[PDB]
Amino acid sequence: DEKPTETYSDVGGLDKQIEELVEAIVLPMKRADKFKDMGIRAPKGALMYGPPGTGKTLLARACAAQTNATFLKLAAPQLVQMYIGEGAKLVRDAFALAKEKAPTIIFIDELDAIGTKRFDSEKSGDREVQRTMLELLNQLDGFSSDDRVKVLAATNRVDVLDPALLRSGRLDRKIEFPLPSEDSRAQILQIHSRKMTTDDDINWQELARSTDEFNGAQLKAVTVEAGMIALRNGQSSVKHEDFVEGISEVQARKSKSVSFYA
Amino acid sequence: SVTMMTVEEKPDVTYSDVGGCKDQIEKLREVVELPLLSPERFATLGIDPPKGILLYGPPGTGKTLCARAVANRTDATFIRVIGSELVQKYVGEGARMVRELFEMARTKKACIIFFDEIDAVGGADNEVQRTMLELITQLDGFDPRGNIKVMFATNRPNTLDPALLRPGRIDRKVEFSLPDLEGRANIFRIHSKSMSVERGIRWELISRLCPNSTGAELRSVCTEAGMFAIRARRKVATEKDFLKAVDKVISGYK
Amino acid sequence: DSDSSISVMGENEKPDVTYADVGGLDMQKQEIREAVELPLVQADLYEQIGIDPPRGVLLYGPPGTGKTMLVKAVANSTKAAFIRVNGSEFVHKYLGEGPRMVRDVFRLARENAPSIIFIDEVDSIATKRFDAQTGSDREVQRILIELLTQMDGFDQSTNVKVIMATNRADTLDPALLRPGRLDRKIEFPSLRDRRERRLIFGTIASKMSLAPEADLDSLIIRNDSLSGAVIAAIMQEAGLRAVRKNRYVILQSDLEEAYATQVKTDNTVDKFDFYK
Amino acid sequence: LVYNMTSFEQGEITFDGIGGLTEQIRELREVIELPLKNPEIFQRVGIKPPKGVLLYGPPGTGKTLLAKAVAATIGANFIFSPASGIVDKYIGESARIIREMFAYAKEHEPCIIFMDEVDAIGTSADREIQRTLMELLTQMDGFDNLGQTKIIMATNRPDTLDPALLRPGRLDRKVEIPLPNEAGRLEIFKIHTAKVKKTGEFDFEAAVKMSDGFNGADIRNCATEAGFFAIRDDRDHINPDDLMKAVRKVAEVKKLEGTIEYQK
Amino acid sequence: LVSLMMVEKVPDSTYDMVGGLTKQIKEIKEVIELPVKHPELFESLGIAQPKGVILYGPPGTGKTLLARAVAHHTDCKFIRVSGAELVQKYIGEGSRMVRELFVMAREHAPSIIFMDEIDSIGSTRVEGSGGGDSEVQRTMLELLNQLDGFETSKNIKIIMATNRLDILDPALLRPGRIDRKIEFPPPSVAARAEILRIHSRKMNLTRGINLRKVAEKMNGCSGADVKGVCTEAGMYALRERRIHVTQEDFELAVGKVMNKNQETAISVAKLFK
Amino acid sequence: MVSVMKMDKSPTESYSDIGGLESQIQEIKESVELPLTHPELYEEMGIKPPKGVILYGAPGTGKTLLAKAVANQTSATFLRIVGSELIQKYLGDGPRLCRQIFKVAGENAPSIVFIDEIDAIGTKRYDSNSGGEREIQRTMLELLNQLDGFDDRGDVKVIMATNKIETLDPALIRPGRIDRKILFENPDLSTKKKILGIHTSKMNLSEDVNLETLVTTKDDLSGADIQAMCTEAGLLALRERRMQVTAEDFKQAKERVMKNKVEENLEGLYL
Amino acid sequence: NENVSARLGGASIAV
Amino acid sequence: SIFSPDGHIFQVEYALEAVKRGTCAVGVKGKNCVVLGCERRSTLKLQDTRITPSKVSKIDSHVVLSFSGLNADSRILIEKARVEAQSHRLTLEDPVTVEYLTRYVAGVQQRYTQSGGVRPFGVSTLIAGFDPRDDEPKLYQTEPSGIYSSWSAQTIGRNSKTVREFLEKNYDRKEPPATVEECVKLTVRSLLEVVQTGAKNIEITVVKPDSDIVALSSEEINQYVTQIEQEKQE
Ligand SMILES: Nc1ncnc2c1ncn2[C@@H]1O[C@H](COP(=O)(O)OP(=O)(O)OP(=O)(O)O)[C@@H](O)[C@H]1O
Ligand SMILES: Nc1ncnc2c1ncn2[C@@H]1O[C@H](COP(=O)(O)OP(=O)(O)OP(=O)(O)O)[C@@H](O)[C@H]1O
Ligand SMILES: Nc1ncnc2c1ncn2[C@@H]1O[C@H](COP(=O)(O)OP(=O)(O)OP(=O)(O)O)[C@@H](O)[C@H]1O
Ligand SMILES: Nc1ncnc2c1ncn2[C@@H]1O[C@H](COP(=O)(O)OP(=O)(O)OP(=O)(O)O)[C@@H](O)[C@H]1O
Ligand SMILES: Nc1ncnc2c1ncn2[C@@H]1O[C@H](COP(=O)(O)OP(=O)(O)O)[C@@H](O)[C@H]1O
Ligand SMILES: Nc1ncnc2c1ncn2[C@@H]1O[C@H](COP(=O)(O)OP(=O)(O)O)[C@@H](O)[C@H]1O
């Protein structure tokens, strides 16, 4: 997918950790020439980690808002059939196209878990993976030349990918994608349910407090397996207990067989 | 083209050739048939249907009887995906199987998989992962909006990266386990329906003697009573004959 | 035969050390050449007396103390073959690289009739006996026994008897050392050597230079912790001072600080922190 | 392929880029003058060179930067090789790779080699790994000659191991570098205010005032920190009250994960 | 491969180079000698020409040095594995060689084998930790006792060996799969007496010689020490330029054993009496 | 692969000369032989008799002696393979070969097979993250899935073996497939009874019988060594030239061989 | 005409 | 010591196997007499058996015991049992019954079960004797779980399986033991299957009313064992 994107959605989740970030990024995109007039080796990117269930790409979609720019299209791409780092070959021509159209939004995915922690697991010859990461550096090298590119990644939190990022000329900065409040996690469940017939005649706010440690990853999954049961029953209207305790309880606990209660 | 033969000549199974606790079948029967036959029930709510019945059940349990049951019922075409024909020493040539399979499969109709024992190939100088990567390339494309499913089984669910097992792959998963005595009773009726016995006795109290155990030993243990009857020359079976050996099958195991 | 895991060392590419680069040590340096340098030549006498040539040694003592200094001046005076090795190459990442090679190792010697070899250190290999807890370690002991039969299993005389360098000599898996497998074992001490410190402290001074405005053999009088590898290491550092100030040869006030410039760290709370 | 290590040398860069604690900076340069420019002196005395050295300084104080500058002084190939980076469950993979390290190394001299986080370097498993620690130390000065190729171990955990330090004749110049005072903190801004505009005054008095415990990396990050929101002023110079709006929180992350730093 | 195979270049040893060892030849030759010397004699009864045997005992013995001479005075072949060389850094190499092994001796009934060490094939346990080596101990034992081994046991006797006994798999031994075992102990004093007579055959019309006057003194385990002290005794004569030798110059050579006979330092821990 | 398989050379191991036991042995003939005598009887009450069995170990205590005796009796084929011989460098070679038996079992209705000491195949389902050795784990799955994919059981018979079970063999076996998990171990008398019930055939005991005390005092041992006990008397005969058959020197072998393998004997504590 | 070989291997690592 | 999920206890699905190792003994309930019989180590050389702790023990004038399993955990019970005996004769002025102390010690083997840091016994015991001022025999059997029963014959020890069923081919309810010579023939015709040696490896004892205790020599045994060593012939 490649486009000058649309409007950023409602900020919502994590937002107090986010307003301080477009601060960090648009200025590299806005009058970094003035920074280059001020004469600084201002960065070409940073990193935003945290567990998924977040809306990471929305912030990527928020990237080109204050300055129009185009997205990225690559996902575990370098895992090829051939000897080559064919992606890494493409990374040159692709980062060359990030060199094209200086207003540009660059976000690869799973930098960690495409790049292991310390790549002790694999043999000496990794298929040029340090070479690919050498491309990333040698492409970050070309990216360090200019202010055209602006780069970021996302994966498991930290200490799961390569430790190269410590140099400020390389990456220089890290943010996390923490666990948010849930009133927006309430709204998104309508968005998950937006493609499905249902109602909302529930007090799911006390509910939203009751659960925790069930990520948007989880909560992007919940919405369907209790739509089936009320259909399996035959109902159509959405409802609290059949979905809330019907999903939140069935996660790990079930088979209520307790006697000494009352 | 080693497994280039869809199905056998005669599957001999029924959904009532099983005790199987009656509950693990419904959603399994629901996912496989209701999108298949009644998508108006899907659009009755306007749903996002699943694509796979993820599963784990210890072997020696009638999931596989249950697996061979949907074969004989639906009458559609069928497969068998196992490391023998799948996994081959020639690197990359192993993935000719998956491609000719699925690229064919999208063409065909009701050619749903039973690619069981993927715990063989799907486990974490070894090239197995790249075949597992060859899979997921095929699935994210067609995954929704089709009569087709991805329903198989295993022995070791914690023996595979769930990087493949994201929610769009096998959502409404499956779990098996041993029965109650009543589940152990209704299954016992099945293999009891062949021989001569002391008709009209209290079979159910033997299903009291089904602690944590498989049905497979029960379809066994009746024959040892007949073997016990053979040595006893009992032309027709009794109660104590079932006892005289079932007391020994577990104690010899214990 | 190629057997590209160790090549003939010292055909033309060799170190350049001498016997006389050592100080004394003749309390051990005599016996070793009393069973090394002569069997090159007077083999007939060993046929006149001695059913076999006494050979096979285990040189030990604390490490960084003087063992490997002596190992190789002989290499300068063999007129015969000689091989080195890293003494833990045998711990290969996979299996079998040793047992495929060690059988090809002595294959190098038997063709290179006569020769000698040596080893860096075997502290990891010394293992008397375990109960089989895992294959993670059992690939050690199987190498050790295979080494032994490769030494005097069947091939008796035409082979070369060999050395054993280490960092300790009590962990050594016994049944290795034997009156027949080795027939010799030697070391050298660490305590004060009034006879040897008095000369080794300036045997290198011949190799070094000095313009005495006074007498500089007086730190030798100051006996507290007479060691063996420091005692040349100091002037290996002390000489870097006259040069640090363009002075052309050092003075005796330059080195006494250089002695203590190697601070002996007698005071360290890491010692005070543990027991109390 | 260890090009990935040994390929950060060619562009000549000044040794001037760090003031630091100059007397130590006077130490390692003068002692490594000798092989290159005035090797006559070792001959006129007939004394062996320094068979490699090490150092110590706590984290994030230009240590690798210090090393990475020296190779460009003279034309070595500055490698980069983390200790923990060469760590594999495979037994010989530890001790096999190191031998190939020196191999390519001696294949190319006069050059240079480097390590940093080696501080990690009766039980069952441990009885094999000490051999690695027993191997490489042997491979320094065990049997072979070493012409024009050297090494530094530059850690942040100076309780590394007794035996490598127990006999400091193998290694020498077991140096230390502590953290700055105002004496140090002040002049470091001069390079960090080099390529940037500024008003002109004795503004750095706050530098000696605070920052008693920071290192060079963050003050550099503090410089750019000020310049970011200094463009709201947007002036053609920069004011020292600007940085003051962020010097706090940088310490609050310097607060985060308090770790001690002893020297040995 | 035939490098492991027997030799047209036999060693030159003998079972009368071997003083002190007097009884064991009578106790172990016959299974290797007699019914194969006379199967019709044995078949007069024909009880079972058993499978191989085993020998246990410490070092210092020359169990090896015994096994070098037995390959002289044979009427049969004597192959050698150069113990533990059979294994390689793979899987398939194991069983094929063992398959190749038996057949290499099927073609030679009057012919036998040699192990020295079975410390490396002992005490198989597995819960994920183990190794392919355990796989090979089975198939050899399988092809030892199976439809195709007794035809070897018709043709064959064999032997195993080691220096540490009880650290292996008992599931190996079905006694009958190994029908006899024996101790090679350390010697007696007077057993040590005739030893030095063997190796010091270097005196030169000398006198005042009391060969008994050394096992007079010893409390060791090895017989090889008789050589270790003898071999370096002549070294004294070798250095002092006089080929001759005597008792006392030969006696203080035990001073080398003054370490061995006294290297075992002792603890002062009177925790318990 | 086929070469080793067809071992049609049964020894003179004489089924029913062996004096071990009955119930086990009817249990197999009932499992195997009688089904090949009048299997209409199974058709009378409608029985699918079992798909082979599995004995246990207790080594040197009668693992196999019946088996080649059955081969002496087999009246059918008989097969024999080894997993270590089955396996190779390359991937799936042996697994590609393992399939090729069942068609060669499809050779016959009289289709039966012994298997040789599985302890290096299908031992236990360690994750085997440590490289290489997953081949074994990749092979067992090629069998058990081949075993019961869709099979009328085609007289696809089997009898297995090992020396220790709980050391391995967690999940491979399942009832019906192998309903009979069965035993062999020491009898506690009957080694006295029928072993020399056999060995009285040749020997003479040229002075007496003495057998009323050449007997077992509940002595923990394995009667397999009795075929030593017969031996060394003849040897000790010929350690002193007795061409006849004695009972006196026969004493030593238990006093000699049974005495080596000592036990703790800590029963000065349960009195 | 061949490059399609691949042989397994044996290791033993500390747990 | 807790509950498994299989309704069992770890430590006590174990303990009662301990008694299944050691010696083997038994008694019976004759027509008008009661007897015991137990085991000894023959071949125990350089020893005089007069003073070794007999597997038999006495508790009162008119009651006895025969333990098995351990020996240490046996000695303790006799003591605190003896207390209850020669205390129960005091407060109430009447001697004991049989069931009373059995009911007592049936309780102590769980007072030493359900508490912190207390093992149960490696012991199982039984008793025998006539109540005072009565005639009917009484014998009771015990094991660490506390459940006290009344077996007409009870054996605990080695090879005891067939011994536990050997009697059932021998005993008859409506054909009880006539007299001592047969009832002791019964007492020995059981135990001898595990003896596998002469008379020296056993010890026996008997009860009759009003505290008529006897213990029988090794030689008295060699009178009767011969009669079936003579009748183990035809
Ligand atoms: N709940 C059950 N319902 C019907 N049959 C059962 C049940 N449990 C066990 N059985 C019977 O036990 C026998 C063996 O079980 P089965 O073959 O299904 O094991 P499996 O699940 O196929 O093992 P694997 O996963 O290794 O293929 C079958 O004939 C089956 O009918
Ligand atoms: N007499 C000497 N002459 C010259 N150098 C000496 C002398 N004694 C000690 N040294 C120096 O001390 C250093 C360390 O000693 P050395 O390596 O011989 O101890 P080692 O026992 O060999 O330790 P390792 O076996 O671990 O190498 C050597 O580099 C050597 O140059
Ligand atoms: N009676 C003897 N006759 C001949 N040689 C003897 C005698 N006793 C000891 N030896 C000597 O013992 C040495 C080998 O004996 P030892 O048992 O110590 O090792 P080994 O048997 O070679 O070791 P392994 O059996 O483990 O391979 C030989 O050099 C041999 O000369
Ligand atoms: N009842 C018996 N009668 C005669 N011999 C017996 C008896 N039981 C065991 N044996 C002896 O045990 C030996 C082997 O028994 P078993 O079958 O247990 O092991 P095996 O099959 O030889 O071993 P493997 O299967 O590992 O090759 C034979 O030599 C046999 O004489
Ligand atoms: N406003 C929103 N609109 C759409 N999706 C949202 C929104 N807020 C959160 N999300 C969720 O954020 C998740 C994306 O998390 P992310 O970390 O990008 O996943 P991944 O790591 O797989 O890229 C999605 O599951 C999505 O449902
Ligand atoms: N003494 C110093 N003088 C000036 N700047 C320094 C000094 N020490 C460190 N720095 C700055 O701090 C950073 C240190 O980073 P780096 O060298 O990568 O880590 P390390 O110090 O652990 O080697 C550099 O960017 C450098 O500019």
Short mmCIF file of C-alpha atoms in Angstrom, two decimals, chain B residues 59-60 82 84 87-89 117 120 123 126 155-156 159 194-196 214 216-217 219-220 223-224 227 231 252, chain F residues 23 26-27 30 45-49 90-91 99 125 127 131-132 134 138 141-142 145 171 174-176 179-180:
data_model
loop_
_atom_site.label_atom_id
_atom_site.label_comp_id
_atom_site.label_asym_id
_atom_site.label_seq_id
_atom_site.Cartn_x
_atom_site.Cartn_y
_atom_site.Cartn_z
CA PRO B 59 -4.61 -39.31 20.63
CA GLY B 60 -6.68 -42.33 21.29
CA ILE B 82 1.45 -35.37 6.45
CA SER B 84 5.70 -38.17 4.38
CA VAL B 87 8.36 -33.03 3.79
CA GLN B 88 11.04 -34.05 1.30
CA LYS B 89 14.81 -33.68 1.39
CA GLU B 117 -0.28 -33.88 12.38
CA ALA B 120 5.39 -32.77 12.56
CA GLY B 123 7.58 -27.26 14.99
CA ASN B 126 16.87 -27.05 9.51
CA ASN B 155 -0.91 -33.81 19.78
CA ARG B 156 1.16 -30.87 21.06
CA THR B 159 4.93 -26.95 19.92
CA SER B 194 -22.12 -56.75 17.69
CA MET B 195 -21.86 -59.88 19.78
CA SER B 196 -23.90 -62.28 21.89
CA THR B 214 -9.89 -43.17 26.66
CA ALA B 216 -10.24 -46.69 22.91
CA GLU B 217 -9.60 -48.99 25.84
CA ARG B 219 -13.78 -50.83 22.56
CA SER B 220 -10.70 -52.84 23.31
CA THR B 223 -12.91 -57.96 23.04
CA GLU B 224 -10.56 -59.22 25.75
CA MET B 227 -11.03 -63.54 24.37
CA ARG B 231 -10.63 -69.41 26.60
CA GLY B 252 -1.12 -53.98 34.72
CA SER F 23 -1.01 -67.77 30.10
CA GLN F 26 -1.94 -68.70 25.00
CA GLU F 27 -2.53 -64.94 25.08
CA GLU F 30 -5.11 -66.41 21.10
CA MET F 45 -19.70 -62.88 18.22
CA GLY F 46 -18.26 -60.41 15.72
CA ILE F 47 -14.77 -59.64 17.00
CA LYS F 48 -11.88 -57.67 15.54
CA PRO F 49 -8.93 -59.36 17.33
CA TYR F 90 19.28 -37.47 4.14
CA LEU F 91 15.80 -36.35 5.11
CA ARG F 99 6.02 -46.76 4.18
CA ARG F 125 8.80 -36.11 22.75
CA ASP F 127 11.12 -30.46 21.93
CA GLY F 131 19.04 -29.28 16.06
CA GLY F 132 19.40 -32.40 14.00
CA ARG F 134 14.25 -33.88 15.26
CA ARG F 138 10.02 -36.39 12.28
CA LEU F 141 4.97 -39.22 13.07
CA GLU F 142 5.52 -40.69 9.61
CA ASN F 145 -0.07 -41.55 11.04
CA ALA F 171 2.30 -41.62 23.56
CA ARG F 174 -2.43 -46.71 22.17
CA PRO F 175 -5.03 -49.35 23.07
CA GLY F 176 -6.75 -51.36 20.35
CA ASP F 179 -4.19 -53.34 23.67
CA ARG F 180 -1.85 -55.89 25.29
#
